């Protein structure tokens, strides 16, 4: 009620974004906290559906329809005035049903990031790089390191050939016609299967290692984005920023996010996160100070994309933009990326082969009806009640001794969770995904019961509870 609070990823500039609070501060008397929650993109509807969480969230806009078909978002508006200072297609991506949900900062794309002094020729396709570690393993060195956990980074590769989230026709997404599992996804995919197998990559190779390996000067290659330009600069490394490879002579095509900034609708301070966000962060003053901690790429606003247009390493990040494509925001976005998670995971350890991996992303992913409406829906009513419920139990965790109340807590959260299993149960073919995640989030429900029976972990019990609540949100955007 006199106070911003404001949840951005933990890549990003946070840092950067505070010193414009600080600025906020400074003339209107409103303190502006920013936090980087983990798994911010699944906590912030989780919190929001309850009335709670930030002010302000800021993420790419393919999570931005889900929030806002939510009812999670309060409706910008901007005058034409300011409209005209960004670029029009970052506003096209902030456009849900008609209408602006939140305000464009920045397009994202990923590059090939190169280490100039073990590679001053970077490979121009993909079919390159087995011959190119062989040779730099002579070294003990490896070719290419990069993030296999997060669909994000290994999708420009599954679309290189063909390969596609939601088909695109008559001004809509199809969201019954998805692209995961034909012909290119499968060529895409398998050859990342074979770079594993024939040891050129690690299948556990994720953020962290491959930023780390990188910036160590131990692999020649790395893909990311421009968040991570300036970890580089402090490290010993001449790096390039260049087109990704080739693959089958396709471009790679990296699915572009435009960052973008939301209010939430249960903020109480809706008018100050609009001045925040509309004169202090969207001026050229404002996204230097982010950018300073870590670079934004291509900005949406004009006047400062003009100062960063001489930039080598931006102009490569537009040409792999160009080359990929915008992602699209519709609600369905988040059972896309958990399903195609779970494919890239499967097929690179080796649980399923790539066929069975890509397959199940299909069917998991893809949307007598009436039946599965209404069950859909109580559904969905039993997982808020759980969440609820959860929400709850992770408050009598915090403090005091009220063991006896906790359990009675999550026994009752157990209760609904087990009601959504069983509505799911019958729900048959097609929700898999969303049956394994109810389970899961089950036995996690188990574990902190059993944490609250024996009293020596405390922590553990929150992060129990916390990684069930996250479970229970994805269950709830995988349900159709
Ligand atoms: O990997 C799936 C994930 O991809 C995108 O998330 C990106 C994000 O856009 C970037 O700003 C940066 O934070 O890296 C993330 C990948 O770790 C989608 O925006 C997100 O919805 C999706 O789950």
Redesign the pocket.
């Known amino acids: 009620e006199g106070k911003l609070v404001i949840w951005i990823?933990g890549?990003k500039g946070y840092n950067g974004l505070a010193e414009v609070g600080k600025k906020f501060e400074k003339d209107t008397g409103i303190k502006v906290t920013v936090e980087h929650p983990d798994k911010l993109?699944e906590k912030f509807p989780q919190v929001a559906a309850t009335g709670d969480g930030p002010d302000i969230i800021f993420?790419?806009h393919?999570?931005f329809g889900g929030y806002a078909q939510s009812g999670l978002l309060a409706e910008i508006t901007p005058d034409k005035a300011f409209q005209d200072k960004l670029y029009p297609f970052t506003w096209d991506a902030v456009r849900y049903n008609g209408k602006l949900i939140a305000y464009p900062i920045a397009v994202?794309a990923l590059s090939l990031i190169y280490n100039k002094d073990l590679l001053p020729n970077p490979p121009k396709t993909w079919e390159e790089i087995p011959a190119l570690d062989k040779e730099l393993k002579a070294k003990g060195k490896s070719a290419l390191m990069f993030n296999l956990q997060?669909?994000?980074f290994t999708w420009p590769l599954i679309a290189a050939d063909g390969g596609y989230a939601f088909k695109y026709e008559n001004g809509k997404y199809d969201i019954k016609d998805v692209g995961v599992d034909n012909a290119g996804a499968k060529a895409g995919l398998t050859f990342l299967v074979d770079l594993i197998k024939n040891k050129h990559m690690n299948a556990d190779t994720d953020y962290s290692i491959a930023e780390a390996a990188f910036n160590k000067g131990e692999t020649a290659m790395t893909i990311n984005?421009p968040w991570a330009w300036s970890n580089i600069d402090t490290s010993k490394v001449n790096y390039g920023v260049t087109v990704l490879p080739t693959f089958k002579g396709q471009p790679s095509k990296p699915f572009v996010?435009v960052?973008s900034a939301g209010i939430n609708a249960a903020s109480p301070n809706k008018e100050l996160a609009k001045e925040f966000l509309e004169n202090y962060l969207l001026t050229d003053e404002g996204l230097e100070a982010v950018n300073k901690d870590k670079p934004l790429g291509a900005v949406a606003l004009k006047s400062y994309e003009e100062e960063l247009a001489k930039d080598p390493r931006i102009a490569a990040t537009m040409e792999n933009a160009q080359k990929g494509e915008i992602?699209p925001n519709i609600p369905q976005?988040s059972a896309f990326?958990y399903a195609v998670?779970t494919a890239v995971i499967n097929a690179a350890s080796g649980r399923q082969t790539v066929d069975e991996a890509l397959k199940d992303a299909q069917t998991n992913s893809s949307s007598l009806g009436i039946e599965g409406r209404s069950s859909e829906e109580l559904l969905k009513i039993a997982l808020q009640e759980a969440q609820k419920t959860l929400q709850q139990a992770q408050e009598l965790a915090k403090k005091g001794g009220g063991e006896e109340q906790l359990k009675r807590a999550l026994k009752r959260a157990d209760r609904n969770l087990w009601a959504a299993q069983e509505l799911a149960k019958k729900g048959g073919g097609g929700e898999e995904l969303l049956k394994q995640a109810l389970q899961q989030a089950q036995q996690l429900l188990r574990q902190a019961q059993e944490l609250a029976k024996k009293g020596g972990g405390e922590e553990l019990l929150k992060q129990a509870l916390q990684q069930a609540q996250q479970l229970l949100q994805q269950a709830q955007e995988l349900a159709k």
């Open positions: 990823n890549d993109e993420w790419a393919d999570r994202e997060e669909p994000y984005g996010g960052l992602m976005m990326w998670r």
